[PDB]
Structures are given as C-alpha cells and as structure tokens.
Amino acid sequence: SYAHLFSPLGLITFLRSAHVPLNAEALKACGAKYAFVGVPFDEGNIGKPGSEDAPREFRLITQEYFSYWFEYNVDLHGKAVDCGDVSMPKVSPEVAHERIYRAVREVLKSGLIPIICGGDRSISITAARALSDHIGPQKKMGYMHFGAQLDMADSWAGERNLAPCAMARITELPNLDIRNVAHLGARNAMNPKDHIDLSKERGLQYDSMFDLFDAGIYPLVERSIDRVWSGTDAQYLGFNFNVMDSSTAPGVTSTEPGGLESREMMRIVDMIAKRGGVSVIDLTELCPIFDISGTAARLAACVIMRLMASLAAQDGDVIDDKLRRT
Amino acid sequence: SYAHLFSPLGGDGLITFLRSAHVPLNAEALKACGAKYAFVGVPFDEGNIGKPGSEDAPREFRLITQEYFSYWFEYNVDLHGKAVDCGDVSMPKVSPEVAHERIYRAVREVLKSGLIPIICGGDRSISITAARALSDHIGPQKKMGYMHFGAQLDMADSWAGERNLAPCAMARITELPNLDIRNVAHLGARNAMNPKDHIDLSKERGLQYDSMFDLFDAGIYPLVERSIDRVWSGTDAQYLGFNFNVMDSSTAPGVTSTEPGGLESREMMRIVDMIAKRGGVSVIDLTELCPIFDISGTAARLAACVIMRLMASLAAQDGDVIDDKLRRTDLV
Amino acid sequence: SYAHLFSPLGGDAGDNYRAPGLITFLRSAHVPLNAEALKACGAKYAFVGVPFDEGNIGKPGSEDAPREFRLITQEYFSYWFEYNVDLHGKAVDCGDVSMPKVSPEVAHERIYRAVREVLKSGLIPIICGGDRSISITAARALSDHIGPQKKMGYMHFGAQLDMADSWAGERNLAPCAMARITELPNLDIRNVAHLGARNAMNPKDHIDLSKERGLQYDSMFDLFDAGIYPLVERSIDRVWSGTDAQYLGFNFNVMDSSTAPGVTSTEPGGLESREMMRIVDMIAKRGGVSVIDLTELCPIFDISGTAARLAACVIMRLMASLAAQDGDVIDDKLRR
Amino acid sequence: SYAHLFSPLGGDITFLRSAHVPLNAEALKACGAKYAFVGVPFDEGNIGKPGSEDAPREFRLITQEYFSYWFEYNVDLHGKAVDCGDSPEVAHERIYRAVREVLKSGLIPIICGGDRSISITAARALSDHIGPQKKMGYMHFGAQLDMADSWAGERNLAPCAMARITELPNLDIRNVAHLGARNAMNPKDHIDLSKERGLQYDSMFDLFDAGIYPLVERSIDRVWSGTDAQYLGFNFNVMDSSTAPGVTSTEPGGLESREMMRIVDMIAKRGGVSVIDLTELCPIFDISGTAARLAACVIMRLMASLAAQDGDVIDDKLRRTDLV
Amino acid sequence: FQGAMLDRKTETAKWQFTPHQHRGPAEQFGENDHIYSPKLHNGSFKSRGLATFMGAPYCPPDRHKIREMGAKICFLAVPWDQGQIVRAGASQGAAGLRDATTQYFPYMFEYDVDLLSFFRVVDCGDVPTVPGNNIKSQEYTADYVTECLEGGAKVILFGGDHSLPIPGAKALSRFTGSGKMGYLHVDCHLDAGPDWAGNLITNCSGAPRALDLPNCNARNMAHMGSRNSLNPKDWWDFYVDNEIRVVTMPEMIERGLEVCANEIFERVKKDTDSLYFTWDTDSIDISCMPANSAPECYGLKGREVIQLARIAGRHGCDILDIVELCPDFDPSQISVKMTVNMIYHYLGSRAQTLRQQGKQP
Amino acid sequence: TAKWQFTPHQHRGPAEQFGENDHIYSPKLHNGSFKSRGLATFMGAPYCPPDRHKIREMGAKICFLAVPWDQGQIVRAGASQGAAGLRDATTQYFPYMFEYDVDLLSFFRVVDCGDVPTVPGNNIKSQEYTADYVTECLEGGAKVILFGGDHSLPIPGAKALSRFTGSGKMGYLHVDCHLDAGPDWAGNLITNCSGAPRALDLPNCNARNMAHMGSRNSLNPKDWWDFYVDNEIRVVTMPEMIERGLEVCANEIFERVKKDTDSLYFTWDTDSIDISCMPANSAPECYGLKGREVIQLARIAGRHGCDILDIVELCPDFDPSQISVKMTVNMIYHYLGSRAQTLRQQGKQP
Ligand SMILES: [Ca+2]
Ligand code: NI
Ligand code: NI
Ligand code: NI
Ligand code: NI
C-alpha cells in the first residue's frame, strides 16, 4: 500500500504509472491528477530530425525513479496516469493536429492536467488552442514558455503552423491577453529580425537570457510568473529544454550555449509551484539521437517530476511524517 | 632525476595510478617504499543494485591519470613518488562475505603500514568494509571522523533482506563504535533516490547531513567549512569518500546513478582546498564510477583531477613543495 | 599446467591480490624489446604495437588501434578446436614502440630498430599499426635483416595500391608505401603480390607506375573472375617459391565494408570473412612467414568492434593454422 | 477485420501486436492461437557481457515494425500467436512450469530473451511433457557447443547447456543436432564430452565444405525422422558477426542471412515443431537493431513458412477495395 | 517581369573546377591533376573543405546555365524526408554523400575513366523544401529536375525519402512527351500503396504513381529486390493486377543477379525513349547498409551492389535516384561510401560503354 | 574582377530568393539550410580565394579561413575535422544577432576563404602554407578568423601578423587550459605547445603585451610555467578568473596586450572551456569556463577588438551532440556581434 515509500523488502509508461485510455470518464474515475500524453509528431520540425523518439525515451528515463521525494515529503505514486501516444497518420499534418486537439480536449474534460511530451514545438500550437477552447470565451488564459527561440515567425517558408511559428499562432488565441504571456530564455542567432519585429508589434514582453542574467534571473522570472498567473483562469506552461545551457541539455533539437543551469531551473520550478496550480504542461524538442548519456532527457524528467512534487507540497498533499517501514 | 617535471628533451607499460611504482599489498614493503599513499583497486560490484559498470572503474581511473603530469604548477608540488599502486583485490565473484573479508584485510594491511589508502571501487558498499577497517585500526580508544559526498544518503537499515548492500552503507558506517555522529558529514543528497526510511533513520540517529538544497541556500562554502570542522576537530583519523554523482550530471555522466542539480567542478575544487587546509586524512575512497556511460572520459577525468588536486593541495599545505628555481636547462 | 585448455574449475582462491599489469596481446606475457630476452622466452611471435598515424592522409583514428586490438584478443581462449592447436605461450607482447610526436623521421627510426631487434631474436614480429606507412619501415628492416645475398617476398591485402611515387611532394606517406617497398633491392617484383584493389581511391599514376614496374596486382575484379582462390594460390606461389623470407601485410579494407567497418578507409565490394579464412589456410600451407603486419584499423569508425574482431580472428587463425601445418598440435588424450 | 493486411485507409506492446492471453492452459487452448510467446528475461546464467536481460522487450518492439502478412507465402500471421511474457533456484522452476502449461494447452511456446542456459529448463519441461514412451529431437544453432559438464563448479550455466540437455532420457543422441560451431569459444572438454556422448555436431567448417544445405538437410532428418516432438533453439551468434552484432558473443565466419532463410524453409518442410527458443540476443550492442531485426525475421519467416507448408494460406483474391 | 530583371541572360556559365579543391597560393592548375595523386598538398582527403559532389563545379539548376557548361550529368540532391511513412532522417543523406566523395578520386581504374571530365559532371545543389508540405515540396522537385533535363543532362537524384520518384518520374515523363518511358524500382519493399491513409504521394507509392503517367506502361515497369513482411498485401496486389514483373530477392539469388538484371533492363527499355531507375538503399542487406529508415536483412551483398550498378551502367538510364540514406544512424562510413560507389560504378560503367560504342554523353 | 555575392538562404534554381535583406529574416520560399546543409559556407558567406587582390575587390573586412592542420599535435589527432563541423553548425543560425541588432554578414562583408592546404607529415611546410595564406587575407585589407586544426596555428598565424605589422608593435593573448610554453617538445620548436615562446621570439611582440588566461590542472609541465615567470608575462589562471570575476580579469588583460600596440593576435583554445560544455577536444578539461562565461568573454573581446582571432583543437567526432560545434559558432558570432556594436557606437568602420 505504502511500501513503495521505503526500502524494498525483497506497457512502457510515464513513472511506471497505470495506463488509462484517452477517455474523460475513465480519467476522472482513476484518481490521478496528471495524464501523460505522448505526441511522437515531428512534421512541423524545420531542424535536425529526432524528436519523434522523445516520448519513448522520456518514459524510459522516468521508470528509473522512486516516487517519494524527501525534499518535498511528497509521494508521486498514483498522481499521474499514462494515456499512451496520440494516434496520428504520417504525411497528413492537418489530421495529426486534429488528433492532438481532440486528445488534449479529452484530458481537459476529465479535469486532469495533461503532460504533453512532444516531438516538435508546433504541437504546442494545437495544445494551447485546445485549452483556449476548453475554458471558453468567458475565461482568461495565461501562457509561459521556456526556450532559446522566440518562434515568432508570422510565416516560415510560406507556412503558418511550423515550429518557428508557434508563438505567433499562440499569441493570436482570443482569450490570451499578451500581458499574460511570458517567454523566458531567448538568446543567440536562431532568432531572425522579423521575430523581434513581430514581438515588438504585439507587445510580447519576452525575458531574454541576457535580460535574465542582468537581473540575477529570479527577480525577473517572479515578475513574469505574476503576469501569467494573476487574474487568469488557466495557465499553460511549456518547455523547450534548449532554454537550458547546452551542457545540461545536449539532446535537444537545437541546443544552445549560455543558458540556464540545472539548479537555476529547479529554483524556477519551485517559484512556479507557489501559484498552486497549472492547467497544461508541455515539453517539446527533446532529441535523443543528440543526447549525451541521456543527460537532456534526465534533466527534463527531473524538472517535470519536481514540478509535480512541488505543486503537491504547495497543496499540502504531503505524506504523514509518522509513517514507518511496516 | 627531474626530467618528469618538464617537456621531454629530444634524442631520448605497466598500468598504474599516476605512473607510480607497484608495491605489493604488504605492510612492511609499503612502509619502506617511501610513498604516502597506496592506491588499491577494488573491482567489486555485488553490492550494486543499479546499472552495472563500476567493475571497470579502477582500470579506467588508472588510465586517465596517465594523461597528466605529476607536477602541479598551481601548488609548486610534484606528486611523483608520493603514491604507489598495490594492484587490485582479487574478486572471487560469488562470495560477498568472502570478498568483503579480502577487502577488510587489504585496508587493514595498508593502514598498518602508515600510508593513506586510496580505495577505488566498484559499488559504494565497499565503504562499509573500509570504514570498519579504519575503526578497528585506530581501536576503541580513538575517535574517527567520516565525510562522504553523494546524491544518496544510503541509510537503509536493510534492503531486499540484506544489510550490507550499497544503499545500506551509511546505516552500517554510523553504527561504528568510535564514530560519534557529530563527527559525521554527508554532503549532496537530493532528488528521489532517498526513500523515507533513509530520512527517518537519519533523523533517529542525528545525522546532520547537508543536502544539496542546504548547500545552495548557504552559498555552499560556509556550510562545507562547518562540516569539515565537525569531521576534523578533535578526531584522530578521518575517512573521506566520494560518489561523484554528487556532481551535476553534466560534468559527471560516467557514474552509476547520475543526478541533475549537483556540484560544479569549480565548486568541488575549492572544497578540496578547504579539506586540505586541515593538513591530513586517513583514508580516501571513490566509488560508483561507471566508465561505460562516460563521454570523453568526463567523469573519470573529473575524479582524477579531484583526487590528484587533493594530494597536491595536501602537499602544499604541508610545505612539501619542490625547488622552484629548478629549470629545464638544468637537465642538459 | 593445462587448465587453460578446459572449462574453468572455479571455486579457486589464494590469489588474494592481483598485481597491476599491462593490456597484452592474447593476455600473453610482456617481454622487453630485446633480442636475447625474446630468444629465451620460448615464444614464436612478438606482438609490436606501433601507434603512429603521422603518415595518414585520411581520417584520423588508427593511433588507437593497437590498444583496441589487444583488448579484443583478451576475450578469446587459447585453444582452437578446428586446428587442435594451443596458442598459449606462442606469442609475447613487447608493448608499443616508443615514438615522439611531430617527429616522423625519429619515429620511423624507432620503428626500424624495433623490427630489427625482434627479427634478430628469430621471432616473427606481428606489427599492429596506426597508418600504412609504417610498413615501409618494417619491410625495409626485413630487407636489411636478410641482407643482399637473400631473396625477399612480399604480399599485401588491401583495397588501395598505394603506388604514389610522391604525395603532396612527400615520399613516405601511406599512399606511397608500395612505391617505396617495391624499391627494396632484394625484393624482385616477381616475388611481390598485392590483392584486393578496387574502387576509386586508386589514382591513375598508381596504375601507371605499377605497369611501368611490372607489379602484377590482383584486383578485386580479377579475383572475382577467377573464383578468388585459384588466383590467390598463384600469387602465394610467386611470393613463397625461391624466397628466403616473406612479408605478409594486411589493410583490412581488403574486406567488405560489412565485415570491416572500423578501418581508416572502408571499402564496399571486398572479401567476406569466410573467404579470408580460407586464404589464411592457403597461406599457412607454405609453412612459414617472416613478418606479419596489420595497419589502418580505425576504432572510432567500428561497429561493435566488428573490424577489430575480424582482424583478431584472422591473425589468431593464421598462427593456429601455421601451428597445425607444423604439426604443433595438442595431445588428444589430455583430459581435465 | 482484414484491414491489418493493407495500407491504412484515410479518415479513422506485444509480440506481433498479438492479443494477450494469460498463461493458463485452458485460456490458451480456447483462444484459437497456435503459438504462445513467452519472454524470459533471465541473465543469472550468463558468463559474458550483460544485455540478454533486455532481449524480450526489444524483440517485441522490432516485430511491430513489420506487417503480419507475408507476400512471399500468401500467409497472415495475425491471430496465430498470443503473448504471455512474464534467486536462480525458483526462477528456473517458474520457467519449467511456464513451459509445461503452454505445452499442456497444445500451443507451441516461443521462448525468447536471456542467456542460453534457459534451454535446459525448456527442454526438460518438454521431455517431461511427452513422457517416457515417446522420442524427442533437439536442434540448436550457435557458435558455441556449450558442452561443459561443469563450469566454475556450476552445472546449469550457459556453457553447460548441451551437456545438460543431452542427458534427458528420451533424447537419443542421433536425434540431436548442433549447427555452427567455430572459433575459440569451445574448450577441449566440450569437444571430448561431445565425443564421449556421440554428439554429431555440424561445425561451421563442415557446413561450408558441404555447401551447407546438404548437411543441414541430413541433421534436420535426424531430428525429425522417428521423433514425436522437436525442440529448435537459436543463438544468433551462429550468424556472421557482420549481420548479428547485437548478441552476447559475436563471432566472424558464420552464416549469411540468405543462408538462414533457406534453412528456415528446409526446417518448415517437416510441417511442425514443438518448442522454439532464442537466447543470447544483446540489444545494447546492436546498431539499427540489426541482430533483433534478423532474429525477428527468422522467427516470423519460420511461422509463415510452416503455415504455407500446412496449406494455411489466405484468400489471395481479397483486395484493399473491399474494406468498409 | 521580376524574373527578367533579376536574371542574367548574357552572363554565361563556365564549367571550371580546381583539381584537389584548394585555391590561393598553392593552387594546382594541371588539366588532369584531379586524376593523379595530389602534388602540392593533400587536397580534401583528410579535411573536407568546401567540397561539392566529386569536387565538380557547382551549376545552378537552370537549363540555360547547364547547357552553357555543356554538363551531361547533373548531381541534384533532394533531401525532402517529410513524405515519409516510417521515420525521418534521410534529409541528412546528401551531406554525408558529398563528404564521402572526398575519400575518392574521380578516376576509376576499373573502367579507366575520368568521370568528371567524361560527363562534365556538375553539382546542382539541393532542392529546397517546404516543411510539412509534401505537395508543394514535390512540385519544387519536379521543376528542379525539369531544368536539368531541359539543360541536356542526365540526372543523378539523391534523396531523402522514396517519395522522390513521384516528382522525378513526373518530370522525366513530361520531358519524354509523346515518347515512351520505362520505370525500374529496386527496393526491399514493393512501394505500391494505392494511397497511405488517403494520401496518394507518400514514399510507399512510387510505382502506382509512375503507372499513372500517360507514357509509362506496365510492360516497361519492373520491381527487383523485395523480401520480408514490411509489405502490405495491396502493394503485392498492384503488381499482380497490372501484370508488372517482380523479381524478388530470393529469385535474384537463385537465378543469379546478372541474368535477372539484364533481363529486367531489356524489359524496361524495350521500345522506350527514356528510363527512370529508382534505387532504395534498403534493397542492400542491413549488414552493408545500416543507415536507412527501414533497413532489412536478406538483401544485396556489397559486391552485388557494385555488380548491379555496373549492369545499370551498361544499359543506361536517364535518371538514377538513390533514396532513404540516413547517415546519422551509422557510426562508420560504410553506408555513405556504399552510396558513393553505387553512383561511381554506374557512371564508370556508363562511360566505358559509351566510349566502347564510339559515342559521347 | 571579384564580386561579393551570396544567395539568401542558399538555394538557387526556380525557388531562389532575391531580397537584399532576406538572409536576416525567416525564409520565405523554402527552408533554406536549417535542416539539410546543402553546399554551406561559413555563415552562408561568399567564397573568396585567399588572394589579396580578390579579397580587396570584394571589399571583405572579415575573412574566415580554416587551418585544419592537426599533425603538429602532441596529444591526439582529430582537430582536422573541426572546420567542417563549424561550417555545418552555422546553418543552424541566422547571420543576424538580435542581442546586438547586427547583420554580421553585410556589416563585415564576411567571406569564406576555404581551407589552408596541408602537407601530411610535414609540420614545417604546412605551417609555411598557413603563413602564406593568412598573409593574403591581411594584405587584402581584412581582419581574420582562423579556425584550427591544432594549437600550432598561432605560430604561423602570429608570424604573418608580425610581418604585416612591420615596425609597429603586436600584442599576443593566449586563452587556454594549458600554458603552451615549451621551449621545445622533444627538440621540436613548433609543436602545438609552443605558441607563446614563438610569439615572444617575434621581433615586434614584447613580453609586456603578452598574456595567458584560463590555465589550471596538471597537464602543464614546469618549463611551461617557468616561461611566464622568467619573462614576466602575466598569467591569469582559471582560479583567479573565478575569484576576481571574468570581466575584471578580461578587461585588465585586453588593456595590457593592446597598450601601445598596433595589432593584436588572440588565440583561443577550446579546452579553456569546461569539459561539460566542450567534450570535443583532444584534451578536454574540467574546472573551465562555463557556457555563459564563454559568450561573455567573446563579447568582451569584441569590445576591445583583435586583428586575428583563432580558435583551435575542436574535434567534433568525439561528441555525439552538437554542443561543441555550436559553442564554437557562438564564440565567433558573439565576438563579431559585439565588435560591430562597438564600431557602430564609435562611428567607426570595420
Ligand atoms: Ca535579365
Ligand atoms: Ni522504397
Ligand atoms: Ni524500401
Ligand atoms: Ni593550447
Ligand atoms: Ni589546451
């Protein structure tokens, strides 16, 4: 019952959790708070290939961990379920995105928090739209994304829903006020001038990595947290782990030097969790073929699990300190 | 001869730690050889419940140390002749009780000589036997200190019905009769490989471990200095052990169980100088290196630099420096 | 003692501690590079590592071949049931030749003296290289060792002719190797064989020079047309008949890329593993060889050690096949 | 539904994506399948490099890269198999009963992963299942004889397998075949013991000299003629290293892939087999899944070839334009 | 009119290359230096520098520029790998291919041919892609291939995925006009899905799309190399229903490569004016070609790949395409260098045949 | 007569783009080379032969020149593959840097001058080629980015800058985990561990304008340290950089090496960078610069400016990721971005 908290007496799923189908009734009844949804889709990727294999590698990494986090006095066992991968045809991106949209809507309908582990960054477009529709036109949405790239291409090669377009599409959602949008970590030269122009035209208040360094990081992060969470009914949190310094995130689609180090992101996770809630969590652009001994996948897995544990600690959902190995 | 300090001149095999001489594992031979440290390889992994690989760590560690000179310009110290290599303890492969006995005799024999064993292991359970050997070596009238770096507390009273596997190490080590808990330091614990009974047992015994969170919040060095003082003040012997998963995964991938959010290499180097300021240590171990997972030998290279810098910094603190007026033109 | 022929007995103790040792060819004993200590050790072969790659005009990596080659050979038992031969004690390892970096003239002299010393002992040097140019020096050492009144034979397996009279203006780089070796004064071109040449790393001047000198190389296309073994047998006969010493050299890019991926310059459409094994047996029927070399193994390109393992089996089966031909077999009646 | 035979139409983890049926003899007999895949991730008999522990999982995943339809045979493997995938002492007894229960159902167990010592227990379970009044045959492919009477003082490790399997009372030595032995992983006591017992092994050298197939044909006949049940085991280090890197102990100078496929058809001519095993796959050493892909294609081709031999083919007139 | 204002009709292209690449003070200038050991330096045998395919001149894919250079072979990379039903990766093939040509001379002693000057090879660069848009990316490929054909050259097309023969054969069919076109498909996989999840133009439909062309007839089509069960029934039904000859790998092995290949080349060329030859790398055994999206055992061996390339060269084709190479899956060079030799032996055998007939390319 | 011409987003043919500034914007007709590198030069810049007359006709103010020579190397080969990894890594970026608002390509009229040829086995002749080639870039009126190859590169590199500086004075900055100051290595004066003594030998390079930054650990024989003590050349070890702060240290050092000089040679070994960020080295080392510090040092260098920047010892075959090659791209890009931002602030041209 609680034996998994202690030293042992002697499908591939996220955290070795149970599989529940993508069905709202089964999800509400299963008792979990999060629903892991794999999206092995990479046909919005304009860069090097590889992110299609991220959901499997991410899952395999998470099966190595215990569920109890002594730093938070929190047990993750039973807090998540795994709904498998969204079923999507190849060479038909429109249908694939509709499948993603219906999968995210079904999770949101159940009341659980989807954890969307992607192939490419364009899946965030559809996931964010699904949340925007889920809460409806009478609600306010917030959106915070971590990444080295603004992804503010109004169009790219004449197309409108590729990975470098994601933020340009997401900031057009009707119940997402731009003042409730945060983007943290932009740096280096994979940011063409029209992305900056479009950001200025729309009032996108991105926190560049340089901006973050100058402020000591955390005071500026706290201010953007406040913009995303104050006065909004739902919050979307997304990660491209090329926001991290290349040394701790080599296995990503477009790795970037001069970013966040692991202890800094762990602090940011705790700052986010103080708001006591999040509506969707995504992670995209992990690229196992470029990884170094699974370093990027393991960093990603550690951030997601600490985020779950930190939210539970904030909610008071900790375990009884009096439990003993019995 | 001083030619090993300098670039080779023109016209001019054994795999050992720092290209140092081999001396048999014999107390009499070790005392007479003149070294201060005796490196002992212990390729034993049958206390390991995680991914395999630490069995090959001693050889890869030895090979990495041969990429470096013995001279440390930062300290004006020459490590040449300061260590010797005693080879490996013979691992019979199916008698953990017997293997630990051979390890116990090996450490007692090195300690009897007065040299400092540098014990390079397979899995962390090797520390149980080495720490017991030191405790028995100093006897019940002496005080022992103990410091370990690692992401895991290893405070399982029992694990899968066993009492001496790697996750049980600290639970056994803190039972030693001449190791007061106030002289015990554990630095770096973090993340989810620390079940509740490891924390419950640590609280029951008063183990004031310095978690990674504790370290970061204190700026690292002020808290490390306090734990150094607890381990070295008033003790007759000190045991220093490393699991290099104390380091951030980015800088030590080749370890048995890598963990994000750990020490930077520059932080471990300063800590090494802080330890060396106390001017002595009785036993040094490093366990859980896992070369099959390493990239460009990163973890092995980091471990070698930490250990050799410790030797160099101890020599500098001791004033055991070389004649800095020496020049390469003196060889000709 | 013969327990090494049989399944390990296990349950054995008393070793207590293992002295630090050296990674050695075939887990064999280390003997210094000294002719008398070599003559007295009882072995027939002396493995010599040559981690030298400053004659390489292609992708880097062969510097690490001697280490990876040795490590592969340490996985195998010494008894070969196909030949009833025990390789234990038949070889020793002399370590690597000591060579300075960025000083190829000195490096080659160190190689020359090393091969001369092993030959002086009467043992067969097995020279595991970095790059192909080390064969120039090794073959010259054999030519000097036998002297001007004796006849030398030379056979090389490789995808490349290496008949550059000069390359980038230089005369002793890897692609020049055969052009230098075919200049040796006691090596008649009629006693020279080169087998396996194929594909486009063979510029026209290598072909012109070969024709100018009468080098009858057996191209891979020639071998296929002949069913391979009939043509190999004739070149074996040219190299061994009427010669006092024979030099046998391998660039394992002679092998099909599928079975030698980890080489400096891998080549499709070559020999398969079972074919090289028959060729090895054909060679051993001549009952002797003076020098064996292998160069241009490239571990950074290998796939699960495939090329290094192929080379190891070729070399060990050659020793085993020579021993069987010599009658140096094991007593069948030996039991555990 | 037959839709699985064709390219998916627009709109809209087990071996071969087959259904799971519990490891229970009655449930297996009623499910309608002919094979029961059993993963056995056991590596406590392995004396070499580790990795065979993960073989059952990677084998399953590789088979999901293929369709169930074999155009070379007009055979559909869909529904012919189901998946039953799962302290050395009790584990071997658990393996024994797992094989006994599948055999009790009448299905053909396909025993995957783990080190070669598992064949000892599966062969013992089959020998007990048929009883003392029937004759058993055994065929194994591998580079190693595994004829150690004992190894490091043990008697049930991987190098002891053939010494144990050939002691079964209903295994006449003339009904035993071992194909592919070569190179130096064969100590003399393994050869001497083979001579003592009359093990008529076909070394790789013997196979090449005979053109392979004439010799394979004779050993097949020795295993299948006059026997009531036949056990077939694969260590894919029988294959040339170039085509099977991801194995425990790879060896150069072995069978090409095209030669094995032809051998598979030769075995399939006999119209039946009692147990199929594969051991010593080692995925951590694999590149592009080469060993796992070869193993998958051999086992599935054997199933497809057996179905074609039995006449168990599909209606070749079915077309994709029939799906509703 | 933007086209006219931007183009330079009166600036003529020159076919010019430096033997062994490097210019500057140590540039070599000998007319034939590229077929001999390098003289002043190492060329690009160790360090790739700015290498084109074979070191050939770059020529923009422009019919007038190609004809001005007199190029008779265009190398054109088509890295598009998002018409792919298996997995991405073939977008990296062309870079590994070009880099691997630095490991060779453009001279083949097995045929005594200088490939570069015999054909006046040019490297036409890469076809651009529109990510996520298979339809538009294939429209680009056909228009680029059309420029090479209209420039008077025969074409080596180097892929990403096997959607390539769809625009490839479309361009050749259009160029062939009222003449007849043959189509040869060499592959482990039958690649004859009528559609894949409703999509007609993925990398599993090259053969049906070719048969749809107005001047490509079933009697001039053929497939070689198939085996194993990544072959849904409808792919095999296509060949049965349309009477298109399939030579499976078991048949090639039993009858002999030379006999089968010569018969097939006679069939696909009988009464045709042109031939499209598409060659998937997974036809090659996985032991020789691990770097593929769908690598397969029971395939061509290394020496047989070169044999088939030679035989193709004896007969000749107007477009040769080679697809699905994924160099990132291979820690060795075996796969990229296999693809170099497919092209080099094809061209070497083609030149030897033309010269033997007293014909020019 | 040479013309400086490039196609935005590389590809010509029917879908070629022609906008004068298209290279700083999201591609319009296609994906450019972000996925498939095609025929990529450094930064997509025009190729220009290392020829003073062509370079000057193009008006190029920055020449990228690869020096892949890796056989003057005392550790292990591999750096001959660096320049290819670098060029390929620049396809992952635009030539526009939003952190500086600079179009690097048109600001400097960057050209790619190809590779310096090598003579395998002949360190003397290969270094002579490097000096001859570097000289053509300098005489063409350009400042130079030299990409190694092993750290023998500053020997011919600084000789060419020294000759070009004539009667003026040259400074020399060496950033490295290793002191690289062997008087000789096994009798050889010009291996990759002698950049600094060979620079001090130059008639117009004085000790007071020389400096070394980044050293630590024990791949540093005593004669390498004795060189700096005996000639009074300031060394700033990595521990000092950490204790005092990179900016303070770097600014002090750039002031020293530039004081009263007419030109500056800046050689930067990638193993100054911590092994966690830079595994692709012949001799990768812990206790080095962190990723954000590398970019900081490149910006600081760009503020002060140098005549030749060289970056050596990158071995991409040792790295399964792109982190090492992309680190070297950012070293160069942030140098140039900061240099351009400074020039534009000063009202000066490159
Ligand atoms: Ca015009
Ligand atoms: Ni295909
Ligand atoms: Ni295919
Ligand atoms: Ni340096
Ligand atoms: Ni350095």
Author numbering:
A (entry chain A): 6 to 15, 27 to 342
B (entry chain D): 6 to 17, 26 to 345
C (entry chain C): 6 to 341
D (entry chain F): 6 to 17, 28 to 101, 108 to 345
E (entry chain E): -3 to 357
F (entry chain B): 8 to 357
Question: What does the article say, verbatim?
Answer:
Here we show that these genes encode a Ni2+-dependent enzyme that efficiently and specifically hydrolyzes metformin to guanylurea and dimethylamine. The active enzyme is a heteromeric complex of α- and β- subunits in which only the α-subunits contain the conserved His and Asp residues for the coordination of two Ni2+ ions in the active site. A crystal structure of metformin hydrolase reveals an α2β4 stoichiometry of the hexameric complex, which is unprecedented in the ureohydrolase family.
For crystallization, we used AnMefH as it shares a higher sequence identity with DmgH than PmMefH (93.5% and 93.3% sequence identity for the alpha subunits, respectively), so that residues responsible for the change in substrate specificity are easier to identify. The best diffraction data was obtained from AnMefH crystals that were soaked with urea prior to vitrification and X-ray analysis. In the obtained structure, both MefHα and MefHβ adopt an almost identical three-layer alpha-beta-alpha fold typical for members of the ureohydrolase family, but diverge notably at the N-terminal loop regions that are distinct to each subunit type. The MefHα subunits are located in apical position and make a close contact between both trimers. In contrast, the MefHβ subunits interact weakly with their counterparts in the opposite trimer. The electron density in the active site is best explained by two Ni2+ ions, which is in agreement with the ICP-OES experiments and the metal dependency of the enzyme. In the crystal structure, the Ni2+ ions coordinate a molecule of urea. In contrast, the corresponding region of the MefHβ subunits do not contain any metal ions or ligands, and four of the six residues that bind Ni2+ in the MefHα subunits are replaced by amino acids that are not prone to coordinate cations.
